[PDB]
Structures are given as C-alpha cells and as structure tokens.
Amino acid sequence: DPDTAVTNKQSFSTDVIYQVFTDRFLDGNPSNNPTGAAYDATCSNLKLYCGGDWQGLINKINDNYFSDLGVTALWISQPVENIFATINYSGVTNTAYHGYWARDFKKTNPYFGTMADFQNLITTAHAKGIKIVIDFAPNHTSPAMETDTSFAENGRLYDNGTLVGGYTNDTNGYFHHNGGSDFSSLENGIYKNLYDLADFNHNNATIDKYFKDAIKLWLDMGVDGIRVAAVKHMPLGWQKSWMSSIYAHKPVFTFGEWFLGSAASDADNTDFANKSGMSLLDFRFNSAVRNVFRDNTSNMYALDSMINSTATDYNQVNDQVTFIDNHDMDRFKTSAVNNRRLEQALAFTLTSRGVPAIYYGTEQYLTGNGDPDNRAKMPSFSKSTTAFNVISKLAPLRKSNPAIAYGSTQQRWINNDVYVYERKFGKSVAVVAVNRNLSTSASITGLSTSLPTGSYTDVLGGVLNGNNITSTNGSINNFTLAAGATAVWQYTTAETTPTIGHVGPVMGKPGNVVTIDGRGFGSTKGTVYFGTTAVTGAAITSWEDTQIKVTIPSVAAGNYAVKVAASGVNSNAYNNFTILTGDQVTVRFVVNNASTTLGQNLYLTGNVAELGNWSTGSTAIGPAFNQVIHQYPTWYYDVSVPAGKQLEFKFFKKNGSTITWESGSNHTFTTPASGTATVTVNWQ
Numbered sequence: 260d261p262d263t264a265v266t267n268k269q270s271f272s273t274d275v276i277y278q279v280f281t282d283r284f285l286d287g288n289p290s291n292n293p294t295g296a297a298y299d300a301t302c303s304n305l306k307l308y309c310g311g312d313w314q315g316l317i318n319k320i321n322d323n324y325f326s327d328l329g330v331t332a333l334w335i336s337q338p339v340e341n342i343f344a345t346i347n348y349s350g351v352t353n354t355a356y357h358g359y360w361a362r363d364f365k366k367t368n369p370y371f372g373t374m375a376d377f378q379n380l381i382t383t384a385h386a387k388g389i390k391i392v393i394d395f396a397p398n399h400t401s402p403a404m405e406t407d408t409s410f411a412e413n414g415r416l417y418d419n420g421t422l423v424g425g426y427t428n429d430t431n432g433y434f435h436h437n438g439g440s441d442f443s444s445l446e447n448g449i450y451k452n453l454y455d456l457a458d459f460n461h462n463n464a465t466i467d468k469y470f471k472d473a474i475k476l477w478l479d480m481g482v483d484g485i486r487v488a489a490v491k492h493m494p495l496g497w498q499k500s501w502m503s504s505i506y507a508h509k510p511v512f513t514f515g516e517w518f519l520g521s522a523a524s525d526a527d528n529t530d531f532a533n534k535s536g537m538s539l540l541d542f543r544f545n546s547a548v549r550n551v552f553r554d555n556t557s558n559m560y561a562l563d564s565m566i567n568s569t570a571t572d573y574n575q576v577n578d579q580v581t582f583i584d585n586h587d588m589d590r591f592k593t594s595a596v597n598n599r600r601l602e603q604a605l606a607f608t609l610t611s612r613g614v615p616a617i618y619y620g621t622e623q624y625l626t627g628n629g630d631p632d633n634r635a636k637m638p639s640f641s642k643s644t645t646a647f648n649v650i651s652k653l654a655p656l657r658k659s660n661p662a663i664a665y666g667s668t669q670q671r672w673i674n675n676d677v678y679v680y681e682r683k684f685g686k687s688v689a690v691v692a693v694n695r696n697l698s699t700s701a702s703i704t705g706l707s708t709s710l711p712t713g714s715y716t717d718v719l720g721g722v723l724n725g726n727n728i729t730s731t732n733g734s735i736n737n738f739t740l741a742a743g744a745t746a747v748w749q750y751t752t753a754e755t756t757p758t759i760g761h762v763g764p765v766m767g768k769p770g771n772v773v774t775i776d777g778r779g780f781g782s783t784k785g786t787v788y789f790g791t792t793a794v795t796g797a798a799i800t801s802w803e804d805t806q807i808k809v810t811i812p813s814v815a816a817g818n819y820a821v822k823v824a825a826s827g828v829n830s831n832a833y834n835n836f837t838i839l840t841g842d843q844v845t846v847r848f849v850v851n852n853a854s855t856t857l858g859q860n861l862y863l864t865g866n867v868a869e870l871g872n873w874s875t876g877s878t879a880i881g882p883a884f885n886q887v888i889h890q891y892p893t894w895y896y897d898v899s900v901p902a903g904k905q906l907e908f909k910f911f912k913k914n915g916s917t918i919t920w921e922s923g924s925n926h927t928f929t930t931p932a933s934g935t936a937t938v939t940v941n942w943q
C-alpha cells in the first residue's frame with residue numbers, strides 16, 4: 260500500500276483531520292438519546308446532550324459530505340462510557356456530552372452508540388478512505404469530592420461493569436489525594452487533580468495494567484490514531500512506557516495535548532515531543548496563526564519565525580498536529596474577523612508542515628466564544644461556502660504533492676503583510692503567497708522559487724483572488740498579489756532516488772515493525788539501515804515505491820538514523836530514531852537526603868540507554884521532583900525503563916557546569932517483568 264492509503268495508521272502527514280464533537284454534529288439515531296435534564300433537542304443549552312451520535316457520522320460519510328470536503332480522517336470524542344449523573348456547578352446543570360468524564364474505558368458511551376455501531380463506524384469510514392482517530396484521556400475519571408460521595412459519581416472507575424474503585428475510601432491508592440493543582444509548577448500539575456477530576460495514580464500497577472489493556476481493545480477495534488488528553492498532567496515516564504506497549508502491539512499515530520499560551524518555545528514541551536514516543540498538537544503554530552490572521556497582534560515575520568523555531572525545536576516537526584482553533588478556545592471566526600482571514604488561515608494551515616486538523620463547523624463559519632459556546636451544534640451541511648471550497652481544493656494536495664506532506668519550508672519573500680513560502684521534497688515543489696492586507700495589493704518583484712521553467716496556475720482557481728505565474732528557472736516574473744489574495748502554485752514529478760518522507764513510529768524495541776514512507780524506493784526490496792546495521796531480507800516485511808515496513812533489528816538501545824539504500828543509491832538519513840532495550844515498565848526512583856544548593860538540580864543516569872548510558876547531558880533523567888509525592892531533600896522521578904533487567908544507576912547534582920556524583924558504588928535494582936515498581940535509595 261502507498262504511504263497515501265487509509266491503511267497507513269502510522270502516518271497522518273498526507274491526511275487532513277476533521278475534529279468533531281460527536282454530540283454536536285448529527286443525531287442519526289434518536290433512540291439512543293438521553294432522557295430528562297440531561298437532554299435538549301433544540302440544543303440551546305450547550306451544557307446538555309443534543310443527541311449527536313456515531314450513526315450521524317456514518318450518515319455523512321455515506322453521503323460524501325466529508326469526501327466532498329476533502330477530509331481524510333475524523334477525530335472523535337472519547338468513545339468510552341462516561342458518568343451518567345448530572346453535575347450542578349453553581350446552578351448550572353452540566354453533563355458529560357464532551358466524553359471527557361469517563362467511568363469505564365472498556366465500554367462505549369451508549370449515547371454515542373454500541374460496540375456494533377462503533378465497529379460499523381470504523382468500517383464505513385475505512386471503506387471511504389477515512390481514518391478514525393479517538394480522543395483518550397487516561398489522566399482521570401470524572402469530577403469527584405473526597406468528602407462527599409454523592410457529588411457526581413465520586414469519580415468511580417469500572418472495569419467493564421465491575422467497580423474498581425472510587426475517590427472516597429481509596430484504600431488501594433488508585434488515585435492521587437494530593438488536592439488540586441494550582442498550576443504553579445510542572446510537578447504540581449502532574450500529581451494533583453486537574454480541576455476536580457479524580458486523578459489516577461499510574462504508579463499503581465492495576466491502573467497501569469488497566470490502561471494498557473484498555474487501549475489495546477480500541478486498537479483491536481481498528482482505530483487509526485489517538486489524541487491523548489492532558490499529557491502535561493501525567494508523568495512522561497508512564498506515558499513513554501505506555502507508548503511502547505502500544506507500538507509493540509499495534510502502532511498507530513499518537514499525538515498529545517500539551518497546552519501552550521504563545522508561539523514561544525517551552526523546554527518541557529519540546530522535551531516531551533522529542534522524548535515521549537508521541538508527538539503533540541502544535542499550540543505554537545496556533546498562536547502565531549491566530550496572532551497574525553485573526554487578532555492582528557503580530558505580523559508575517561512572527562509567522563516565519565515560528566516556522567523556523569519549531570522546525571529547530573522538534574525532532575520531527577512533521578508529526579505535530581496544527582489547527583486554527585479548538586473546543587478549548589474562542590472560535591476563530593468572530594464578528595470583527597473577516598471571512599477572508601479565516602479562509603487565508605486555513606489555506607496556510609493546509610499547505611504548511613505538520614498534520615492539519617479542522618475543528619468542525621469552520622467551513623460553515625461557526626462562531627462561539629469560550630466553553631461551551633465554541634461547541635455549538637453543526638448548523639449546516641452546505642458545500643457552498645468559500646471556506647468549504649478552499650479545503651476541498653487544498654486538502655487533496657497533501658495526498659498528491661509530497662512536498663506539502665513531507666517537505667521543508669523556506670521563505671521566498673516577505674514583509675509586514677505579505678508572506679511567500681516554499682515547500683520542497685525531491686523535485687516536487689509547492690509555493691504559497693498570502694497577502695493579509697484586505698484593502699491594498701502588493702507588487703512582488705524579485706521572487707525566486709524552485710519551480711522549473713513554465714507558466715503556473717493558481718491551484719485555488721482564483722477563489723481567493725489568486726493569479727497565475729511564469730517561472731524562468733525559478734525566476735518568477737513580477738506580479739501583483741491582489742488584496743486579501745492567496746495563490747498556490749505547484750510542480751510534481753516522479754522521484755527517481757530513494758528519498759525518505761517520514762518514518763513512524765520513531766521509537767520501538769527490537770521486533771517492532773515501523774513504516775518508512777517516501778519516494779523512489781523502487782519496487783525491488785533493498786536494504787534498510789539502522790545506523791550501520793543493514794536490515795535485509797524477510798525483516799523488510801514489504802517494499803514498494805512509497806512505503807517500506809521493516810522490523811527493528813537487535814542492535815544496542817540508542818539513537819539512530821534511518822537510511823534506505825535502493826538499487827545501490829543511498830537515501831537521506833531520517834534522524835533521531837529511538838531503539839529501546841526491550842519492553843518497558845515504569846519505575847519510580849526515590850533518593851533520600853539529597854540536599855542541594857540554590858539552583859542546583861538532581862538528575863539520574865545509569866547503564867541502559869533509557870537511563871542515558873552514564874551521560875550527564877540531555878539524555879540523563881531529570882530534574883527530579885521534590886514537592887508533591889515526596890518533599891525535599893527527598894527527590895523522586897518516574898522513568899520508563901527496560902523490564903526484568905538489572906540496572907546500575909547513580910544520581911548527580913548539576914547547576915551550571917559542575918557535576919557532583921554520588922560517591923560509593925553504583926546503586927542496583929532489578930526491574931520487574933511487567934507493570935510498575937519503586938526503588939528507594941539514600942544519597943551516597
């Protein structure tokens with residue numbers, strides 16, 4: 260299958276995601292609707308169910324609404340069973356319509372549908388070439404009050420009907436009872452409750468085993484991707500460990516929600532993206548896009564700078580999910596924002612790097628500020644709006660032009676209001692010009708591109724006032740970019756040299772199968788390179804021009820570059836591919852008496868790649884925590900680490916340059932065969 264098929268659960272670069280709140284889209288089945296205070300047919304009280312379901316989704320798939328719009332994947336509300344109780348917040352009745360207050364991850368929300376409906380949705384979606392991505396929130400159950408079991412459902416958790424435990428009288432410690440996060444530190448938001456949501460204690464082996472089993476079920480149902488909710492609030496170590504379990508079973512594209520409030524780089528965010536095993540929603544791309552297109556608080560340079568900085572910060576920037584709005588923020592469209600601005604923003608998003616996601620209703624210009632107004636019912640299924648048109652013209656390009664899907668980005672011309680960027684990959688090119696000025700046009704002279712000699716036509720057909728151009732060996736002739744104009748020009752050709760577009764996942768242990776997508780691989784099974792190790796033969800489970808599935812070899816745990824040698828020609832190296840020691844388990848390391856100096860931090864390192872292999876640099880573990888679960892001078896940290904292996908490890912203090920290690924011999928511990936563990940040591 261090509262990189263381009265719906266069969267490609269490992270890569271969404273060629274896809275366009277449509278984010279839909281199941282409840283607010285379409286009620287294909289009224290029989291499954293809630294009753295009483297929980298239901299509102301007019302869908303005027305946005306905190307109540309409105310009946311949207313999977314059958315509604317199925318219906319629109321079948322009448323090609325999505326196929327005509329161009330979207331190739333659907334991201335839906337968390338499918339699991341939620342609390343049935345209603346919650347009264349300062350007089351207002353709230354329901355679990357959003358799907359985020361789960362009570363049983365082994366079952367479906369019956370208001371959405373049944374196992375059969377779900378299986379029917381996956382099949383119908385696949386028959387039309389639409390991948391299905393599910394929201395999943397392993398961070399918590401639902402709102403709960405420790406001192407009041409009657410509020411909501413006391414955050415109870417059921418394992419397929421069977422009660423596992425509630426927040427009150429939690430003798431086994433399935434949850435954290437450290438109060439609620441004040442968001443003052445990273446440690447704080449991880450070990451304390453997100454709002455009033457009962458917080459899971461993933462160090463509890465039952466909870467760790469519940470989530471592995473739970474996700475395994477949905478992957479088996481055929482899901483093609485996962486949106487992990489609130490990744491900033493669970494320990495990276497547990498999630499990494501969970502990610503490898505998924506990748507070892509049935510690898511699917513996985514991205515997570517790490518909320519950022521600006522285009523600015525965040526060290527914790529970058530680390531996560533680069534070390535967890537999953538990618539992230541790009542809140543940095545979102546701020547710059549909104550700042551420039553919607554709010555007018557920044558200009559074209561800001562946009563360009565965000566393109567350059569994120570590409571520098573993330574190991575795989577192409578794995579980041581972009582968007583112009585979502586259910587946790589004001590709809591892009593507002594009274595002061597014009598339609599052309601919304602349309603230009605989509606055009607930018609759809610031709611830029613990453614995996615584009617469109618919040619439902621954008622094409623209908625849906626308005627709505629805040630929660631839940633930004634979660635209004637899908638008002639129309641019109642295929643006439645320009646917004647709708649722009650998406651149907653551009654979306655397919657991610658499929659047809661590999662430069663959009665896998666290419667690099669380069670500025671070709673710019674100023675306060677104008678931005679002309681270029682996407683390239685092999686001989687294929689795509690050039691985009693955006694003039695955000697709604698009242699005045701710009702004379703563009705001296706524009707150079709990679710477009711071979713020839714005259715080009717706007718791929719938008721001029722719907723966004725685009726013009727056609729002429730290149731003379733990349734030299735574009737002077738032209739005027741009309742007001743509020745945006746034109747897309749492109750050039751595509753067959754690649755003749757093996758060239759890697761994407762590898763996914765980019766983490767795994769020996770035995771796992773990874774997918775390498777690109778061009779020019781040829782149809783004659785060659786050799787795949789993991790660093791210096793050449794993988795040939797039956798290990799390469801498939802080999803075609805745009806996709807190779809290959810088994811990760813038994814080489815030392817570490818960082819590698821993937822190269823594909825096709826017919827004697829070696830391709831480009833796809834860097835930072837992480838090979839693990841083997842299966843993971845999550846171990847909490849605790850150290851007593853590690854007192855420090857103003858600005859000194861505690862780290863950890865040991866004899867396995869997962870512990871940094873005695874490194875004190877960016878591969879060491881830390882800085883350790885010292886506030887919630889354990890207080891200074893006791894530090895602790897959850898680390899994904901190989902299973903049933905004997906590790907040697909030592910802690911070290913580091914402020915600036917000076918590294919001070921623990922004296923004595925290394926500490927030792929033999930990690931468990933499965934699940935989780937805790938090992939406490941005293942600073943030597």
Ligand SMILES: OC[C@H]1O[C@H](O[C@H]2[C@H](O)[C@@H](O)[C@H](O)O[C@@H]2CO)[C@H](O)[C@@H](O)[C@@H]1O
Nearest residue numbers: 357359396454487488489516586587630
């Ligand atoms: O009950 C608190 C809030 O829970 C949800 O918020 C989600 C948010 O929308 C999602 O993107 C993030 O991943 O997790 C939080 C918590 O589950 C509801 O969507 C909100 O309306 C609630 O207020």
Ligand SMILES: OC[C@H]1O[C@H](O[C@H]2[C@H](O)[C@@H](O)[C@H](O)O[C@@H]2CO)[C@H](O)[C@@H](O)[C@@H]1O
Nearest residue numbers: 872873874907909920921922923924925
């Ligand atoms: O760097 C490889 C070795 O790291 C540790 O050795 C430390 C030692 O623990 C500490 O007392 C001394 O001051 O520095 C050395 C070197 O950094 C491990 O203990 C060894 O097993 C490793 O080979």
Ligand SMILES: OC[C@H]1O[C@H](O)[C@H](O)[C@@H](O)[C@@H]1O
Nearest residue numbers: 453488489490491516518587
């Ligand atoms: O809307 C609720 C939000 O609360 C916090 O900002 C969390 O970081 C985020 O995960 C969640 O979306």
Ligand SMILES: [Ca+2]
Nearest residue numbers: 288292310312
């Ligand atoms: Ca319904």
Ligand SMILES: [Ca+2]
Nearest residue numbers: 449458492493
């Ligand atoms: Ca948490």
